[PDB]
Each structure stands twice: as C-alpha cells, then as structure tokens.
Amino acid sequence: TTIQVIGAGLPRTGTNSMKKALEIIYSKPCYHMFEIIFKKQSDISIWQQLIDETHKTTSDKRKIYNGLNELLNGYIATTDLPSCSFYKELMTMYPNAKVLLTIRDKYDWLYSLRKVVLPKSTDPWKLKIEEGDQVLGIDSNFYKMSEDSLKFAFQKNHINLDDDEILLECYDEYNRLVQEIVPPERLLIHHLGDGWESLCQFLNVDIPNGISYPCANSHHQMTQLTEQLIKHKSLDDIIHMFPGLI
Numbered sequence: 070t071t072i073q074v075i076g077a078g079l080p081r082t083g084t085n086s087m088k089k090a091l092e093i094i095y096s097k098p099c100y101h102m103f104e105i106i107f108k109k110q111s112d113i114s115i116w117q118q119l120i121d122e123t124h125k126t127t128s129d130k131r132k133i134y135n136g137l138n139e140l141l142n143g144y145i146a147t148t149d150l151p152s153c154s155f156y157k158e159l160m161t162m163y164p165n166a167k168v169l170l171t172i173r174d175k176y177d178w179l180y181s182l183r184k185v186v187l188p189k190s191t192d193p194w195k196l197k198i199e200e201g202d203q204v205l206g207i208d209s210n211f212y213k214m215s216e217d218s219l220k221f222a223f224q225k226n227h228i229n230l231d232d233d234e235i236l237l238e239c240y241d242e243y244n245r246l247v248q249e250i251v252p253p254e255r256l257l258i259h260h261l262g263d264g265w266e267s268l269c270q271f272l273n274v275d276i277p278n279g280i281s282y283p284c285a286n287s288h289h290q291m292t293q294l295t296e297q298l299i300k301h302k303s304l305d306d307i308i309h310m311f312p313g314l315i
C-alpha cells in the first residue's frame with residue numbers, strides 16, 4: 070500500500086467527498102482531517118512537529134519526508150488539511166502519484182470556511198464550535214495545528230486570518246500555484262459537481278456501476294453536528310443522526 074493520489078484541494082472544496090470517492094475506487098483508506106479528528110488525535114502533535122520543521126531557517130526535508138511516510142502508512146491517498154499543504158513534498162516522495170485539485174467558487178468557499186473551519190475571532194459561533202469540539206476531545210492543540218497548516222499552505226507568517234479579502238486572494242493564489250507547479254498531465258482539476266467521469270478517466274478506472282458520487286460534509290450538517298454535540302454531550306449518543314459522515 071502506497072500513496073496513489075495526492076489531494077491538493079483546500080478544506081471546504083469537497084475533500085471529504087473526494088476521500089470517500091477514492092476509498093470507493095481503491096477499496097483502501099484515504100487520509101483527511103476527519104481521520105485526525107475522529108480516529109487518530111494522536112497524530113496532531115506529529116503534524117505540528119512537521120509544520121514547525123518548515124518554519125526553521127534550514128528545514129530538514131528528509132525529516133519531513135520520513136514524518137509524512139509515517140503518518141500516511143496504510144493509506145492509498147490523501148486529501149484536505151493538513152496533508153494538502155505538503156503536496157510538493159508528497160509529489161517528490163511519490164513520483165508516480167497523481168495530483169487532484171478540488172476547487173469551487175471562491176465566495177462560496179469562504180462562507181463555507183467561515184461557518185465550519187475558520188470563523189472570525191469576533192464570531193460568537195466560534196465559541197459554539199469550540200464547545201462542541203470539547204465533547205470530541207478537540208482543543209487548542211488541534212486549532213493551532215490546523216491554523217498553522219493553513220498558513221503553511223498560504224505561505225504566510227503574519228497573516229490576518231480575520232480579513233476576508235486576504236483569505237480570498239490567498240485561496241486564488243494557492244489554486245493558481247498548484248496549476249503552475251504540477252505538470253498538467255499529472256493534475257486533474259475537479260470542480261464541485263463534476264462527479265465520477267473526469268476522475269475515473271484520470272485514474273484509469275471505470276465509473277463505479279450504480280454507486281453515486283459522494284455528497285458529504287455540508288455546512289448545514291456540520292452546524293447540526295455542533296448543535297447536537299453541545300446538546301447531548303456525546304458523539305456516540307448522536308451519531309445515528311449523521312449517517313455517512315464519519
């Protein structure tokens with residue numbers, strides 16, 4: 070088992086649906102932030118170490134390659150933060166792996182990002198997200214790793230995360246650089262709604278017979294999850310309300 074597909078798309082661009090789609094195609098696990106949050110919170114400090122390594126004057130690329138290889142052992146693919154921020158390193162480690170860039174309208178993306186992943190620090194909803202996350206054992210260590218991974222993706226040290234104009238241009242910039250760095254024959258750009266056919270051709274497989282392309286992880290559902298985590302204080306007690314999410 071080795072990485073076949075490197076997902077370079079940013080959070081809220083359909084990465085969880087792509088994760089599920091790749092697991093359907095290959096019948097092997099794909100990495101995603103949900104793997105960290107719901108299955109392996111122990112990985113948070115490992116990711117934090119790697120991102121930190123990138124902030125050294127002279128970063129040790131072999132330390133990073135080895136960390137990545139450790140983290141992704143047994144996975145056939147990667148999507149979402151924090152792995153997407155390392156797509157260049159992943160490309161080097163796995164020269165035969167193809168690259169996917171999931172993408173969507175930037176304004177739709179920002180609204181989705183604000184409601185689920187990166188609320189403004191002035192948003193009361195941020196406190197609700199944090200309360201719900203405590204139920205899952207998710208705390209400041211997680212938030213620091215995820216924010217750091219985003220800043221690493223965007224290649225910014227000091228950045229005002231609360232500024233929508235900065236995020237919007239960072240988003241466009243990120244997507245543009247992926248297209249300029251990855252050779253076109255090694256890259257598929259997948260827009261929301263594109264479904265199986267460009268993906269499957271790209272990966273040299275048939276369209277899965279009678280299996281629909283996944284449509285997962287909407288902001289409405291994530292808002293509901295937060296609301297129910299706060300209300301019932303137990304993931305196990307509410308997971309029947311969220312089929313196919315985790």
Ligand SMILES: Nc1ncnc2c1ncn2[C@@H]1O[C@H](COP(=O)(O)O)[C@@H](OP(=O)(O)O)[C@H]1O
Pocket residue numbers: 079080081082083084085086149177181261262282283284285286287288289
């Ligand atoms: N097959 C599909 N078609 C359209 N939108 C999809 C989709 N799969 C996922 N999405 C959208 O992708 C976003 C989540 O992406 P990610 O998994 O990276 O967090 C959500 O957007 P919204 O929050 O606007 O509803 C979700 O609704």
Ligand SMILES: CC(C)NC[C@@H]1CCc2cc(CO)c([N+](=O)[O-])cc2N1
Pocket residue numbers: 080081102103106149150151185186187198201202205215216291294295
């Ligand atoms: C469990 C949920 C109710 N609260 C956790 C939230 C939503 C899921 C999530 C997903 C990502 C990337 O998909 C990131 N991220 O990259 O910062 C952060 C978070 N945080």
